[PDB]
Ligand binder design. Structure first.
Ligand SMILES: [Ca+2]
Ligand SMILES: [Ca+2]
Ligand SMILES: [Ca+2]
Ligand SMILES: [Ca+2]
Ligand SMILES: [Zn+2]
Length: 316
């Protein structure tokens, strides 16, 4: 829409108050003209037709319970855009400031959220397994990172390349959660998963086996479910990334941590310069080693830690 840029206020899924960028033109719309070609949030009104209607509001105050998922989709897309711009110098997901569009209230009782190739889509959850999925900043950033991967490495969504694709989304989702300093951790989806149980999450990067995902290449899933295990075998790479950052000893192999910032620079470089659509785990190891070599030198501690981490999860 064409109108005047302004700032409104509302409450997210978790009850927290936040300011959001809006546009005025008769109604106030969830349209943020301050970032790239804009961030636009739509109401799918419990249907599956997309994108739905651009979110319009009469007084620029978004404190209704139907408003919550839209406030957080809109706000967390802006935080993810800022992370990629300020930390990695990347303008939006295509690198040229493409508009980011999200629809909320998709379908009824839908326990998922996803990047469909053109925009973000968020279910409200059934209220037991999940509450509206845009209340999780790591979920939002995980899904928007699929758009980055689509425009760069183009990892296909199956077998080892799909598991790399998911892991990359969990890694950067976690780094955005630390960047926003929103009670950060190495777990995925803990703010929106099972409102009645405390302490759990969908996946864990620091200990993937806590939920039964593999934490070593010898335990990888080899069947056909989940497109060949893209959500299951991502635990092997998530554990490697957690060790590079934080360090630790895993299956007897010791890794000195180099921290989150360097983790993010090595993986962003590997993703945007060396991975291809059919890269497998072994090629991800080579790409991460070459990236760390590019950035810090072949005899750095950073290269050594990347190697130990992949050796700790059995990826040669
Ligand atoms: Ca209102
Ligand atoms: Ca957290
Ligand atoms: Ca998290
Ligand atoms: Ca829970
Ligand atoms: Zn994903």
């Amino acid at each position: 829409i064409t109108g005047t840029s302004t700032v409104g206020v509302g409450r997210g899924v978790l009850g927290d108050q936040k300011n959001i960028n809006t546009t005025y033109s008769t109604y106030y719309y969830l349209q943020d003209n301050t970032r790239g070609d804009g961030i636009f949030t739509y109401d799918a009104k419990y249907r599956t037709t997309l994108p739905g209607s651009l979110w319009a509001d009469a007084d620029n105050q978004f404190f209704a319970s139907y408003d919550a998922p839209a406030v957080d989709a809109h706000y967390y897309a802006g935080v993810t855009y800022d992370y990629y711009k300020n930390v990695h110098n990347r303008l939006s997901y295509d690198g040229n400031n493409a508009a980011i569009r999200s629809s909320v209230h998709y379908s009824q009782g839908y326990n998922n959220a996803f990047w469909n190739g053109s925009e973000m889509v968020y279910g409200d959850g059934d209220g037991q397994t999940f509450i509206p999925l845009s209340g999780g900043i790591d979920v939002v950033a995980h899904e928007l990172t699929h758009a980055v991967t689509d425009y760069t490495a183009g990892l296909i969504y199956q077998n080892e390349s799909g598991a790399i694709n998911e892991a990359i989304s969990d890694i950067f989702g976690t780094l955005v959660e630390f960047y926003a300093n929103k009670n950060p951790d190495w777990e995925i989806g803990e703010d929106v998963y099972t409102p009645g149980i405390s302490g759990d999450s969908l996946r864990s990067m620091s200990d993937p086996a806590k939920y039964g995902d593999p934490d070593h290449y010898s335990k990888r899933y080899t069947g056909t479910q989940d497109n060949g295990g893209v959500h299951i075998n991502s635990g092997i790479i998530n554990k490697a990334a957690y060790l590079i950052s934080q360090g630790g000893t895993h299956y007897g192999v010791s890794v000195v941590g180099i921290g989150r910032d360097k983790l993010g620079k090595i993986f962003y470089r590997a993703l945007t310069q060396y991975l291809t659509p059919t890269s497998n785990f072994s090629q991800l190891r080579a790409a991460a080693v070459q990236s760390a070599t590019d950035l810090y030198g072949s005899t750095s501690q950073e290269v050594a830690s990347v190697k130990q981490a992949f050796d700790a999860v059995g990826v040669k």
